Amino acid sequence: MIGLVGKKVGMTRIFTEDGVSIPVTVIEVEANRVTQVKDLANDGYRAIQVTTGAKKANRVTKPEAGHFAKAGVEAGRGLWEFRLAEGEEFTVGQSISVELFADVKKVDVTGTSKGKGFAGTVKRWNFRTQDATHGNSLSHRVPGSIGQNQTPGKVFKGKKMAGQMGNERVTVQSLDVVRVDAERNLLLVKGAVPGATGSDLIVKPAVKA
Amino acid sequence: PVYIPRPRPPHPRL
Amino acid sequence: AVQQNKPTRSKRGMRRSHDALTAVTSLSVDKTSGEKHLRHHITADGYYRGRKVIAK
Amino acid sequence: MRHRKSGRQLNRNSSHRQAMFRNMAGSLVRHEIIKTTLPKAKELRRVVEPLITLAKTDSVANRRLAFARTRDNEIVAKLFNELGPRFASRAGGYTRILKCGFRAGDNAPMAYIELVDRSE
Amino acid sequence: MIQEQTMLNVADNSGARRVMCIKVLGGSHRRYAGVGDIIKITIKEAIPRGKVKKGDVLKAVVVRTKKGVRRPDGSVIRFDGNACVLLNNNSEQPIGTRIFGPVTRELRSEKFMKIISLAPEV
Amino acid sequence: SNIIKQLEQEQMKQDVPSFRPGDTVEVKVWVVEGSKKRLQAFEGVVIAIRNRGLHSAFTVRKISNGEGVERVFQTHSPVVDSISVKRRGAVRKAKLYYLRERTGKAARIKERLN
RNA sequence: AGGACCGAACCGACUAAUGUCGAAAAAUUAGCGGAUGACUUGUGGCUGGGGGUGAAAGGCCAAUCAAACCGGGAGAUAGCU
């Protein structure tokens, strides 16, 4: 089915009576309000656009404000989109709560991983460090060779070099839903999800069974 | 100039 | 380490196509003294947002 | 990679930074307004405003803390004698930064930092 | 975290005193041996009339590590040294008849029941 | 976070007694040999305490049959059934890691009797 | 007492790193050797080019050494480029 848009509310653990400790990420999933329903006749595919949270009526622009007023919902902190799965139908202005996940066992969570900035090859690609001693000249964390010789005469595309690490769209799949608490608007999922505290997460039912 | 340094020895292609 | 051919005036100017300075888009007029100044900077006489703050 | 970290290094080591901010705190308490660089002023807020918060309560242990942190008895007296009573009702924010152009010799962003009572 | 060249104390009375891990068994490129793990050892130090000889190559099961085991609740059990029980090289079947120092529940399996029974603790 | 504090309060146990590093403490924890649920005692000196609300832990250092053992217990973990202070110690450090390189007579803490 | 020992100055230069369009045409930093002697150092002097001097490496003889440098024979000669 479709997913929800939550916010990463940090991590903690659930102690169970049988003794186990479960590391859970806490995702506050407020009501996702449908701002637009896309269909084959007009858009060519079936999806719902949702919003969540709240913005200020000075940071919401006139185009955004009109797009929200057409739906009848109040402005949220952005818009997301979920493809419909042939069996569900949503109306503009409908609220979807975390109760959508009441029966879900595993979810995929998509976040924007924490940004590491410009990373070297050791950190970014698990490149092996060269010698610390034994004669090494200024070449301890340097990448080593990047190509062969005259015969290729070039570096191949997709060479693992240094560059921007993190700050990108990551999906962690098949995380156990530990708890769905509808009154608190909370989803407790086992393990870590991408991103920092307070970042948007997209939680949808697991695509691999 | 007046002083030209000796060039560095080549790689010993021997 | 070093070039095999000298670059051209064309390549030189194309590289310098990003070296152009940006002028300050606008200057601020002081509430009280009416002097020009940078946003969020005191004026040359020591006013900021209409009040004498330095008296230099 | 600097996530959630505070404190400007200011291209100094820790001992030099500590001594420089001790001196600058003394100078700001003495003159009630000083012209420095903008990053130095922003970093000096976190040095001088705790000193005034300390000086709000006048005990011997507080005098000795202020001395351990400023190393100037004239400064420790101006705090606890003038600035503490002056800012007794301020809930923080005893300093004000005013950006003032750029330095001639190196084009450094300049800022005045003053105490918000200096209206005389 | 036992790897090759790690020296372990001997937790049984098979005669060995210090052994060296020469191979972490099970899996290519496998790096470490935790508690319930079988390693290949050589005997670096033994007692004169023991059941094993110095320089013997055989197997051993780790029973205590300084690194320790973590429990499902997050708890940790660490020890002040790495110890192992020597096993016959073909069938594991501990060589000694006594076992010194405590062990952990991680050793409660079908093949180390002898060890879990002979141990003086846990 | 208020949300996480609310989720952790509802799990924190209230029976947790007061103890300090240096105190000799018996921790009774739950052991499972399959069907039966037994209670096992671990008595030793508290060498470290980590106060983090629900994530609080404490390291107890025992000297078992020969080998010395340390056990980091999670305080609010349901496997820890009970914590009792058998003896109060009079150290003046928060962490007693120097007790690791001490044995016998050099490893004994004077009693607090405060 | 000692071409004794440990160790500063001092005299060296074993290792490593840096530097290698250097701070430096030989260094710096950390260690290292000798450190009352066949020691080290100042000032002055003497030995000179097939000559000197050399606890000897063809080492050194003014950042030049299997024959210094300067000037001359000299526009040597160059079946080579």
Place this chain on the structure above:
RNA sequence: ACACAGGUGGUCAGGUAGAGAAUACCAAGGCGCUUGAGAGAACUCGGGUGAAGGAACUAGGCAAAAUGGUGCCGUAACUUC
């Protein structure tokens, strides 16, 4: 060749600790080394710390780590004693 991390003989040489002209902190005295201001990526340099392991590194324990003082006890083979 430089306002150059080099070289350059002699004399004077205080305090506390110290065996000391070592070393640390100071005195007298003299300086902050003639680009600064920010930021706080990779990587390089110079350092600090490090779970478990402990030479598995490597040509080689290179480098690093380690040892380190005084007094007393005690000290093997071998020896030219």
Place this chain on the structure above:
RNA sequence: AAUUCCUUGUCGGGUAAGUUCCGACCUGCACGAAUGGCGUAAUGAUGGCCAGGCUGUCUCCACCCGAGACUCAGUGAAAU
């Protein structure tokens, strides 16, 4: 063997595993007696090998402190 080609000779020791090392053998390609032979205490910034300790040398890197690198202002090269 600073000498031995075959050759990593053989046997012994040391290692789980030793082309190195140490001991011995002698089949010395091609030792040998002042161009000295053999030994040798002490000595050596000497060559080789082993052990204890010690460790970021390594498994396998992590973090931190500074100087650069990066941005701004000023000055302003070089090989090619």
Place this chain on the structure above:
RNA sequence: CGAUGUCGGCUCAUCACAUCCUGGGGCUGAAGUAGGUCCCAAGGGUAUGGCUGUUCGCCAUUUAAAGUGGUACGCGAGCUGGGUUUAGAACGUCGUGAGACAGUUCGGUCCCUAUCUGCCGUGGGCGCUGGAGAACUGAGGGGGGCUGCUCCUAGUACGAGAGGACCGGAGUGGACGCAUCACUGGUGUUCGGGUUGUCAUGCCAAUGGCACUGCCCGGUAGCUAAAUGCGGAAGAGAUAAGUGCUGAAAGCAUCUAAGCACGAAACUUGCCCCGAGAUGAGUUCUCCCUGACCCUUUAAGGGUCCUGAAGGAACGUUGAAGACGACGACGUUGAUAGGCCGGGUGUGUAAGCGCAGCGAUGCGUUGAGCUAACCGGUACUAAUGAACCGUGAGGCUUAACCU
């Protein structure tokens, strides 16, 4: 030959397939297990040590396996320098000798600030035909794809016994990857404490500087691995080798000629990420601007005045964003940062005072004091009115509909 750096190692690879493992199959002198041989198959994977400068090889112990080759037997403007290749020295040997040795032995400077191509990242410009804010589609591209063991089936099939399955399930690992910091830890020169030497604050007391953070002991946040969650798939399509069904040519036979099936980690998908400069520049939603004159070759023309929207940019406070740009959040109608308040955390019973003691010191006040980056609040300070850019209804042709 007016120089194309030469072994091995390291680092990083990349391709082939003559395939080492895993996958599929035929034959077997294939009972099972386990093999042999051949065919298909390159998706992924494909040891650590001792010796030696080694490539190689020997050995030890693993592994599902420890593939074979190409790539200047890849890779020194990436590293090393043990070997080979200078100058010293010695041995054996050769030579009268100087010297020589695919003989050995000890020692012996490894430069380059990247212009271009390439590659990894990240921006600016313009375009995309009125402008703008969003959300998408998805051409196309990349990533990923490994595998052990145990148990059930079942001690069943098979087998005289020994031994011992296929097929199909379940669990738990190794290596690899992604994320994260709840836990366990590392770090934590920005927190607290102990302590040595010395100097200073007049002195005592208390503090501060310096001594590598002087040396240490702990330790917040952040970052992080050794910590912890997750992943490789299932499925689908089309196939390889192979196996067929029906079936003539060729009355039979025949997998093939017509036709119809099955068939593998290979291929296309499915999973994840990028992605409309996809100039073939796409779609959807929303928002904004509907004022006049002059001139000329009355041109998709130029000029003047008035008008400046949506939005943006700039500036400021900044960020779990970041080299810089960029990106995100705020700018008084405000929690953006600092301060402050409360808490937490860490350290660990401050100072002063009093008491005991000859004193060092202990005790009480007191789990005190202090406490970074944390949490929750709070306009005290700083985020200024403005100004700036961006316009004024958007070409032609044709077609389809209301006039």
